[PDB]
Design a protein around this ligand. Structure first.
Ligand SMILES: [K+]
Ligand SMILES: [K+]
Ligand SMILES: [Mg+2]
Ligand SMILES: [Mg+2]
Ligand SMILES: [Mg+2]
Ligand SMILES: [Mg+2]
Ligand SMILES: [Mg+2]
Ligand SMILES: [Mg+2]
Ligand SMILES: [Mg+2]
Ligand SMILES: [Mg+2]
Ligand SMILES: [Mg+2]
Ligand SMILES: [Mg+2]
Ligand SMILES: [Mg+2]
Ligand SMILES: [Mg+2]
Ligand SMILES: [Mg+2]
Ligand SMILES: [Mg+2]
Ligand SMILES: [Mg+2]
Ligand SMILES: [Mg+2]
Ligand SMILES: [Mg+2]
Lengths: 171, 39, 58, 71, 51, 110
RNA sequence: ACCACGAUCAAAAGGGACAAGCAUCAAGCACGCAGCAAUGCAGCUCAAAACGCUUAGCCUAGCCACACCCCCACGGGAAACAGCAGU
RNA sequence: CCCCACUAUGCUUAGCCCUAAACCUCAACAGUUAAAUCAACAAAACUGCUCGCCAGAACACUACGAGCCACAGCUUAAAACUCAAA
């Protein structure tokens, strides 16, 4: 998070803000503001770090950054409010809308899609093809079918050596 | 339904016609077991 | 042309165009921006369509 | 509208709940037997797999779990 | 001959595209000039209010 | 020029790259619904040989039939990447684009 | 007739296409790929219906399948009209 | 049904259960008020597009199968016999 001494986004570019009394600097810093003011500073840092034009807020890049800051705020909220079903819904929906943005950014501008993922620390994942309940009977059979495959592979290799050994003896 | 829905469902699957007491046959041979009257 | 694959792509480029792939390996790009649908049909008929004589014989 | 369709369903549901209450001990014995057959049918399904793959016994260290018991 | 005629029709459409794009840049610049002026006034006003 | 493979030239979208030197390509064709007389997309999967492993999931590729299949399901090879995913070059102008917008103006090189 | 680097006809093999009902058949369980090989990778099919069950000769200048049964027919059960007439 | 007393329960914490006439029984998005306004009633009549759902009554918020922390449960959900109606 930005330091508490950080000035608000509105007062950072006023002339003479560095020569005012320390008390005035405390009153115009993040320490004396609500968390939403800290999130505006985080959004500004990500913009300059990632997007080519930090002033264009309507580009697909800026929206992914704006939404990514909201997602981190919900995650921090839900860390303290674990039974808040309203904000848990907002988190899951926001994650689903960022994936829809990242998909559309990957399809249109891959070089920018790569910078957005590196800058925000997002690991893009392709959706699974089939969403279906892995119930007990399925999770047990699939495990057995993988074990049976693994054992058949081992037996097939022990049928390569014995055949190889016998062939050498003939010579 | 929408055209996409009609295409996805396909033509309506008409249930196979049921067979009555004769099992789809015009007549059947039978052996009488008992006679009686019904109201 | 039931055996000719036709595939559509939306909003992938700034302008609309047709591209034909021929058996030889040749590719025919047809720019259609500003053209009416009737002009597009007449254009591809001229460059890649069978003439009326070839069809009469068949 | 009248509630005549609801009333038919009302009585059907009432009589069903009462029947289940009257026979809840027989139904519990039947349910237990079905779960046993269900478990056996599941074990056979897995045994068919390794047998059709050429193995003679279950994969080393494999124990088929009981996936239908309340525990 | 038809493949060459098609390439020539595309080149013709390209010159019309370049002419159309030049007229759109001049219009974009005019608008972009006003928005910067307006946006500069809003900043100076917003900056004065904050100062 | 002869080949035993039915589909000689097909365009499709790469939907899988998990096989070595093989791209899984979804090819869609228009098929007429006889009752509705409306065309609906019908998709089929083709494995295409990709020697250089240059195909990315989501890019449009052109497949060429091989003279004879090289594997049970590999009957085609990658002939050309038509539209690289997120890196499309406009064929009409030759300039890079991001959707319906140019990334470099056609007026740059006149 | 023979040779036909041909035509006609048409197997095997390779590619594609090709019935109906049931989704209370929803997962299949090795179903993939690369490599000269060694071997390596862990993949392949599927709610756009895989897998499964049931039903049915079919798209009729005709075609397919079967030819007592064990899909096959070395072998075995056994001793054969689903050729015509006939019982 | 009326009167009195009192418990589970209504509360909190931690986990389950996943059902309502959960109905404003009127789906989402976009659009219209002109033509034929329009079965009746209700909350005037419609267009575009899309998804979901429906196809006589009853059997049946049932049986069986399957899934589920559910074990007198929930969801999904038939058929036979019967009727000329509902
Ligand atoms: K036979
Ligand atoms: K209501
Ligand atoms: Mg009333
Ligand atoms: Mg009743
Ligand atoms: Mg053949
Ligand atoms: Mg059932
Ligand atoms: Mg039959
Ligand atoms: Mg016989
Ligand atoms: Mg035989
Ligand atoms: Mg005879
Ligand atoms: Mg109490
Ligand atoms: Mg209270
Ligand atoms: Mg309510
Ligand atoms: Mg409702
Ligand atoms: Mg909806
Ligand atoms: Mg009914
Ligand atoms: Mg109920
Ligand atoms: Mg029930
Ligand atoms: Mg049950």
């Amino acid at each position: 998070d930005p330091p508490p001494s950080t000035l608000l986004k509105d007062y950072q570019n006023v002339p003479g803000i560095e020569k005012v009394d320390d008390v005035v600097k405390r009153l115009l810093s993040l320490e004396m503001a609500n968390k939403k003011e800290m999130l505006k500073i985080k959004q500004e840092q990500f913009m300059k770090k990632i997007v080519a034009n930090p002033e264009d807020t309507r580009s697909l890049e800026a929206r992914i950054i704006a939404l990514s800051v909201k997602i981190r705020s919900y995650e921090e909220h839900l860390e303290k409010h674990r039974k808040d079903k309203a904000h848990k819904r907002y988190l899951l929906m926001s994650i689903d809308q960022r994936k829809k943005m990242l998909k559309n950014l990957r399809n249109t501008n891959y070089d920018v899609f790569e910078k957005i993922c590196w800058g925000l620390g997002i690991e893009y994942t392709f959706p699974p093809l089939y969403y279906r309940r892995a119930h007990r009977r399925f999770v047990t059979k699939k495990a057995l079918c993988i074990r049976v495959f693994q054992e058949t592979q081992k037996l097939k290799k022990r049928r390569r050596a014995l055949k190889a050994a016998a062939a050498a003896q003939k010579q | 339904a929408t055209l996409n829905q009609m295409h996805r469902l396909g033509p309506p699957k008409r249930p196979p016609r049921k067979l009555g007491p004769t099992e789809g046959r015009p007549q059947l041979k039978g052996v009488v077991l008992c006679t009686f009257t019904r109201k | 042309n039931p055996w000719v694959q036709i595939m559509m792509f939306k909003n992938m480029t700034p302008s609309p165009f047709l591209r034909f792939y021929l058996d030889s390996g040749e590719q025919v790009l047809v720019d259609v921006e500003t053209k009416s649908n009737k002009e597009i049909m007449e254009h591809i008929r001229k460059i890649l369509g069978k003439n009326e004589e070839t069809l009469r014989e068949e | 509208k009248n509630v005549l369709k609801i009333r038919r369903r009302k009585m059907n549901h009432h009589k069903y709940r009462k029947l289940v209450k009257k026979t809840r001990f027989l139904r519990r014995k039947v349910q237990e037997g079905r779960l046993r057959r269900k478990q056996i049918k599941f074990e056979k399904d897995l045994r068919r797999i390794w047998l059709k793959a050429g193995l003679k016994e279950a994969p080393e260290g494999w124990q088929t779990p009981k996936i239908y018991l309340r525990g | 001959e038809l493949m060459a005629w098609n390439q020539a029709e595309n080149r013709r459409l390209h010159e019309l595209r370049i002419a159309r794009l030049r007229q759109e840049e001049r219009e974009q610049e005019q608008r972009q000039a006003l928005e910067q002026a307006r946006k500069a006034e809003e900043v100076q006003a917003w900056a004065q209010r904050k100062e | 020029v002869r080949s035993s493979v039915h589909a000689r030239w097909i365009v499709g979208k790469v939907i899988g790259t998990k096989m070595q030197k093989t791209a899984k390509v979804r090819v869609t064709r228009l098929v007429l619904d006889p009752y509705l007389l409306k065309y609906f997309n019908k998709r089929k999967t083709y494995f295409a040989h990709d020697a250089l492993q240059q195909c990315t999931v989501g890019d449009i590729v052109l497949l060429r039939a091989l003279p004879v299949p090289r594997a049970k399901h590999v009957k085609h090879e990658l002939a050309e990447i038509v539209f690289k995913v997120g890196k499309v070059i406009d064929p009409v102008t030759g300039k890079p684009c991001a959707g319906t917008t140019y990334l470099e103006s056609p007026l740059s090189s006149e």
